[PDB]
């Protein structure tokens, strides 16, 4: 509204669409690096605590599985990031 106070506070000008900055991209999953990550995955295996999570999930005790995963990593977002990845591996193995 061209106003100093409000949810759209500030001046009103003609807004310009900024060109895409390449450093914003990092974190993207290229097909080639995804393929290489697949190869190392099938050639290296999984860490010992991953194997315990497989056993925990195959036993269907998900609460303890996420609790110990958070204890191993340190953050809930990392624990969730693990869980979806190893369950995703689970149906692939099945």
């Amino acid at each position: 509204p061209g106003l100093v106070v409000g949810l759209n506070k500030g001046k009103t000008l003609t807004k310009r669409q900024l060109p895409e900055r390449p450093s914003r991209r990092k974190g993207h999953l290229s097909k080639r690096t995804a393929f290489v990550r697949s190869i190392v995955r099938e050639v290296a295996g999984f860490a010992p605590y991953e194997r315990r999570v497989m056993e925990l999930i195959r036993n269907s005790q998900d609460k303890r599985a996420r609790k110990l995963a958070k204890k191993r990593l340190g953050t809930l977002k990392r624990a969730k990031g693990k869980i979806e990845e190893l369950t995703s591996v689970i149906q692939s193995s099945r």
Partner: protein, 180 residues
């Protein structure tokens, strides 16, 4: 530990000689580069205009000069700054345009003005940028006639409403999401 300033006139003289030596060394070109017009990033100083570090890639491309040759002819380039409004865009664009219009480029190898150069270059003279490109301030509004709908418009009554809307924005934000 004390820091005394008995070398203040000495420092001032040394800086002036360094400027003088710089001018003598690179006399054909101005001793200060072109700088873009840039607005300070705060509510206390957003009403002013000062000299930024350098132009952006979008401004350089819109003006028609490439980012590679821009450094060579003396146009500093900032790769971090971005233009979020056309008002700043054509503002810096017209700064470059007037710079280029007043700019003369000596041909290299002194054989012919290959594409972008100057045919006659005997009129060389060292002049500061500020004279040709005097950075200005925000345009001060001149007198305008009385607006009738603005006259009916109260003023801070609105600022009270959008304020109350802002403070209790989460209050109704909850209200809709919980009832929906």
């Amino acid at each position: 530990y004390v820091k005394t300033w008995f070398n203040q006139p000495g420092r001032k003289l040394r800086r002036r000689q360094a400027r003088q030596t710089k001018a003598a060394k690179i006399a054909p070109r101005p001793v200060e580069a072109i700088r873009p017009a840039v607005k300070p990033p705060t509510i206390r100083y957003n009403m002013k205009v000062r000299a930024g570090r350098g132009f952006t890639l979008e401004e350089l491309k819109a003006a028609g000069v490439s980012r590679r040759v821009a450094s060579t002819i003396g146009i500093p380039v900032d790769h971090r700054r971005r233009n979020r409004s056309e008002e700043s865009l054509q503002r810096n664009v017209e700064r470059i345009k007037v710079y280029l219009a007043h700019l003369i480029v000596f041909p290299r190898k002194a054989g012919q003005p290959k594409k972008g150069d100057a045919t006659d270059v005997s009129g060389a003279e060292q002049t500061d940028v500020a004279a040709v490109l005097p950075i200005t301030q925000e345009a001060v509004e001149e007198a305008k006639p009385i607006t009738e709908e603005a006259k009916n418009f109260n003023a801070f009554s609105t600022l009270s409403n959008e304020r109350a809307y802002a403070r209790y924005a989460g209050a109704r934000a909850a209200f809709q999401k919980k009832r929906a």
